Design a protein around this ligand. Structure first.
Ligand SMILES: [Cl-]
Ligand SMILES: [Cl-]
Ligand SMILES: [Cl-]
Ligand SMILES: [Cl-]
Ligand SMILES: [Mn+2]
Ligand SMILES: [Mn+2]
Ligand SMILES: [Mn+2]
Ligand SMILES: [Mn+2]
Ligand SMILES: [Mn+2]
Ligand SMILES: [Mn+2]
Ligand SMILES: [Mn+2]
Ligand SMILES: [Mn+2]
Ligand SMILES: [Mn+2]
Lengths: 104, 93, 97, 78, 94, 108, 84, 99
DNA sequence: TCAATATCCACCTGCAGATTCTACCAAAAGTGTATTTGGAAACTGCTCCATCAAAAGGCATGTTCAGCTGAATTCAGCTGAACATGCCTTTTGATGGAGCAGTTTCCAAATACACTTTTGGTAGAATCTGCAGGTGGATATTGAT
DNA sequence: ATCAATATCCACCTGCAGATTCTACCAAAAGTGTATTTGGAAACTGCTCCATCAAAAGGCATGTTCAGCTGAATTCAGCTGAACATGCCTTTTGATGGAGCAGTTTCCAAATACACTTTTGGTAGAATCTGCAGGTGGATATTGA
C-alpha cells in the first residue's frame, strides 16, 4: 500500500516527499511532485546502470565499478553534458590520443 | 544511529535492467551522489520557478518544467514521459 | 644494447595511464601537503582519511583535465611539448586566472 | 612538502592527460597550480569544519567545498 | 494600482554619504539594484545550505557570517564581517 | 505606546533591516530566522554598495561627470581586483570593457 | 505577417568587426564572419529556449525581460540592469 | 597625395574607439528579427517586451566581445595577429562550451 | 628483409577482500479526521506590443589595390626522453591511547504566532539641471621623403 | 629630420530628456503578550585518528648519451585592410487598435496538522565469489643492420 507501488515505482515516493518538504524549497508540496520527481530519478538511474552494465560486460566483468560508470557517462553525449562539471572518483579518463602525437 | 541512502533502490533498479550484474560499494557511492545531485538540481530549479511566479507550492508542473530546463534533449523527453506516466498511474487505482 | 626512440615509451605510458584509475601521486607526500596547507587556516586539525582521499581524487582529476587543455594549447602553437605558457593560457581561458 | 609532489608523479598525471612531451619548467608551474587549487578548496572545507565547531575535517566538508568551487565530486557522501 | 519595491532609496542615501556631490543615472541605479539582490541571494543561499548541513533549522547571524567568508574574497570579507558584527552588537545593545 | 524605533536606526544602518528580515522569511532559506541575521545581512549589503559607489563615484569624477552611469560602475568593478572576482561572471549592461590592447599588436 | 528567413545574415561583417575591435582584435580572417554567426546562433537559441520555457510555465504569450534574465542566470551568464 | 594610413593603423584606432565606448555594436532592427525568427521556431505566436529584446542583445554582445578577447589570446599564442576559426574553436573548447 | 629485444595478449588458476544473505526493531510512511487556504475561474481595467506611414542620412555593400602577414622550407643547436644504477622514502600493518564526534537530558533564551497601531516607501506630479551634441582651435599622430 | 594630411583632445555653450525633490495613501514594519522550540551546557561513549615502530620494496633521484623538436631565418603568394563611390534600409517620430498582462473577488479541491497503526529501512553478523595478480607460452611491435 506504499505510494511507490501505487505509482508503480521502485524509488521511494514517501522519502522524496519528506526530503522535498524539509529542504526549504517551498511552503507547500503537491502530492504529484514527489511521484514525478521519483520517477525522474529512477529513469536516469536506470539509464546509467544500463550503459554501465554494458561497459562492464564489454570489459568481461559482471560487477559495475566506477570505471564503468565513467565509461558509460563520457561515451554518451547527453549524460556527458548533464554531468559535465562532475568528477566520478576512481573513474579515470577515456583513452584518447591526439592524432598529431602518433608515430610516423 | 542511522544514515539513509538510495542504495536499496538503486540496487533494485539494477536488477531490472541487468538481473545478472552486480555493483561495487564505491560504484554504489557514485550512484548515491548522482541521485542526490540530480535531486538537488531539480528541486532547486522547481523552487525558483514557483518563487518567480509567486506560488507557494511545488507541483508536478514545476518538477516538469525544471526537468525540461535541466536535462539535455532526449533525456528530457523520456524523463518527462516517465514522470507523467507515474503521476497518472498514481492518481488512478 | 636496445633503446626505444624518444616518444615511443611516452606513448606507451599514455596508453597505460589512460587505461587505469589509480591515484598517480604518492599518498603520504600528498597527505603531508594537505595537513601543512590546512594548518595555516586552523591549527591542530584532524582529517577523516576519506577527507584526504576526496581531496586527492578532486585534485588529480583537476590536474589531468588541465593537462588536456594545456596539450590542446601546445598543439595549437604547433608544438608537441607543453610549456608554462600553455598552462597559463588554458587557465586564463578557463577564467581561473 | 610541495616538493614531495614529484617530477615522475606529475609526468604520470600529464600522461593520463594525453601529454607526450614535457618541458623542464612544467614541474614547478604544476606545483604552483596544485597549491592554489588545494589552498582554495581546503580553506573552504575548514570554514565548514569551524562552522560546525569541529576539529576534524570530514569528507562532507571537502565535498561541500568542491561543490561550491564548481568541482562537484561523486562518491564521498555527495 | 500595482507597486514594486527596490533598494533605490537606500543606495541613494549611501551614495550621498560617500559622494555628497554625485548623482546616479536610473540605468546605474538599475544595475545597483541587481547587484544587491544578487549578493543577497548568494549570501542567503549559502546560509540556507550551511544551516541544512548542520541540521539546524534557524539562520542566525553566525550563518550569515560564515556565508560571507565563503563568498567574498580577502579584504572585502574582513571589512564586511567587521561591519556586520558591529551592527549586531549595536543592535542588541537595545 | 512606546517610541517607534526602526531596527535600522537601532542597528545604525541605512539599509532596511525589516525589509531584509521579511525577504529572508519568505525566500524559503530556513524554517526559522534569527533576529541578528537580517541586521548582519543588511550591513554587509550596505558595506558592499558603499564600496562600489565610492569607486564608481571616483571613475565618474575622473571622466569629469557628476552623475554615475553604468560605464562608471564597470570601470570601478573591473579595475578592483576583489570586486572583479566577486562579479567575475556578471555582465553590466551598458558597461563596455576596459581599454586593453595586447603589446604585440602595437606598431614596433 | 511576413515570413522570417535568413536573419542571421543581419549580423553583418562590419558589426562583427566592431565586436572584435571592442574585444581587442586587430586582424580578422575572412572565415571569421560565418563562424561567429554560427556561434551567436547557438548562444541565442539556448538562451531563447530557456527564456521561452519560463514564459510558457507562467502561461504567458509574452517573453518578459525577467524571463531572459532568469534564462541567462541559469546559463551562468548573470545580467545586471533589467530587473530581478 | 593621396594619403593612406598603413594597414593596421586604422584597426588600432578602431580598437581604442570601441574599447572607449559602450553602445551596442549590432544594428537594432536586424538583431530583433533574428530573435523573433529563432523564437518562432521554438514556439509560435510569441510577443516580446522591448526590454526583453534589449536584454538579449546586451548579453549576446558581451558574450561575443568576451569570446573575441579569448580568441585573440589563442591567435597570439600561435604567434599570429589574425584571428581564425580555429582560435574561436580552441577558446570555446577550453571554456567548456563544447567538446 | 633479417634477427632479437622487449611488449602485449591469452587462457587458466586460487586465494580473499568484499559482496551477499540472515535475523531484528525502532524511526518513518500510510490512515483517518478536521480545518485551512492556496491560486484557479471570472471578469475587466489599461499597459504596452505589433504595425504601419514617411523622411533622412548613417552605414552596409562591393570593388580596387598592394602592404605585410601567414605558410612553407630549412637547419643547428640543445633540451628533454630513454636508461641503468643506487638508496631511501612510502607502504603495510597492527597495537594502543586518546581526542572528540555524536546523544542525553535539562530549560533559559530566542522565535514564531495574533492582532493593533504606526509610518516609512512607492506612485505619479511637479521642479530642476547634468550633459549630449554642436562648433572651433590647439596638440598630436602618421607616413612620405 | 622636416612637414603635410588627418585625427584627436579640450573648452566653451544651452535647451531638454531625464533626474530630483514633492506630497498623499497604503502595504507592511513596529509594539505587546503568549505559546513553542531551538539549540546550547555538562557528562559520557565508543569511534577512528595520530603515533610508533619495522622492516622491505618498489619508486624516485642521478648522470650519460643523443634523437629529434623547437626556435630562428628567410622568402613569397595573395589575403585582408584602407579608402571610395553608391544608395539601401535602419532609425526616429507619431499615433492607434487591441492582445493580454496584471488586478480584485469568490471558493472548491488539495494541502497541512494531528494523533494512531503498520511497515520499511538501517544495522550488527554470517555465508560466498568476482577477479586481482601470477604463470607460461605464443605472436607483436619496434629497431637496429
Ligand atoms: Cl502536484
Ligand atoms: Cl613558457
Ligand atoms: Cl541571530
Ligand atoms: Cl582556421
Ligand atoms: Mn522559421
Ligand atoms: Mn486565499
Ligand atoms: Mn548598396
Ligand atoms: Mn605583392
Ligand atoms: Mn610573419
Ligand atoms: Mn560632448
Ligand atoms: Mn482581451
Ligand atoms: Mn525489512
Ligand atoms: Mn588479470
Amino acid at each position: 500500500k506504499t505510494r511507490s507501488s501505487r505509482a508503480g515505482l521502485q524509488f521511494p515516493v514517501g522519502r522524496v516527499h519528506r526530503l522535498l518538504r524539509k529542504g526549504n524549497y517551498s511552503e507547500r508540496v503537491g502530492a504529484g511532485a514527489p511521484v514525478y520527481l521519483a520517477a525522474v530519478l529512477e529513469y536516469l538511474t536506470a539509464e546509467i546502470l544500463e550503459l554501465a552494465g554494458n561497459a562492464a560486460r564489454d570489459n568481461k566483468k559482471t560487477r559495475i565499478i566506477p570505471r564503468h560508470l565513467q565509461l558509460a557517462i563520457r561515451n554518451d553525449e547527453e549524460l556527458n553534458k548533464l554531468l559535465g562539471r562532475v568528477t566520478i572518483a576512481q573513474g579515470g579518463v577515456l583513452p584518447n590520443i591526439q592524432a598529431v602525437l602518433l608515430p610516423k | 544511529s542511522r544514515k539513509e541512502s538510495y542504495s536499496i533502490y538503486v540496487y533494485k533498479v539494477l536488477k531490472q535492467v541487468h538481473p545478472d550484474t552486480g555493483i561495487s560499494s564505491k560504484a554504489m557511492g557514485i550512484m548515491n551522489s548522482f541521485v542526490n545531485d540530480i535531486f538537488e538540481r531539480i528541486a532547486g530549479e522547481a523552487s525558483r520557478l514557483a518563487h518567480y511566479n509567486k506560488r507557494s507550492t511545488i507541483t508536478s508542473r514545476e518538477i516538469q518544467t525544471a526537468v525540461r530546463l535541466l536535462l539535455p534533449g532526449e533525456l528530457a523527453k523520456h524523463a518527462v514521459s516517465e514522470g507523467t506516466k507515474a503521476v497518472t498511474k498514481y492518481t488512478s487505482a | 644494447p636496445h633503446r626505444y626512440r624518444p616518444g615511443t615509451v611516452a606513448l606507451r605510458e599514455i596508453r597505460r595511464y589512460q587505461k587505469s584509475t589509480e591515484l598517480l601521486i604518492r599518498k603520504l607526500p600528498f597527505q603531508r601537503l594537505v595537513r601543512e596547507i590546512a594548518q595555516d587556516f586552523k591549527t591542530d586539525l584532524r582529517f577523516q582519511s576519506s577527507a584526504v582521499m576526496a581531496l586527492q581524487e578532486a585534485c588529480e582529476a583537476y590536474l589531468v583535465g588541465l593537462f588536456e587543455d594545456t596539450n590542446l594549447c601546445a598543439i595549437h602553437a604547433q608544438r608537441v611539448t607543453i610549456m608554462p605558457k600553455d598552462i597559463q593560457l588554458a587557465r586564463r581561458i578557463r577564467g581561473e586566472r | 612538502n610541495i616538493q614531495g609532489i614529484t617530477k615522475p608523479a606529475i609526468r604520470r598525471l600529464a600522461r593520463r592527460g594525453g601529454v607526450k612531451r614535457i618541458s623542464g619548467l612544467i614541474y614547478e608551474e604544476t606545483r604552483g597550480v596544485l597549491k592554489v587549487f588545494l589552498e582554495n578548496v581546503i580553506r573552504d572545507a575548514v570554514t565548514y569544519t569551524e562552522h560546525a565547531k569541529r576539529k576534524t575535517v570530514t569528507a562532507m566538508d571537502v565535498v561541500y567545498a568542491l561543490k561550491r568551487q564548481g568541482r562537484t565530486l561523486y562518491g564521498f557522501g555527495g
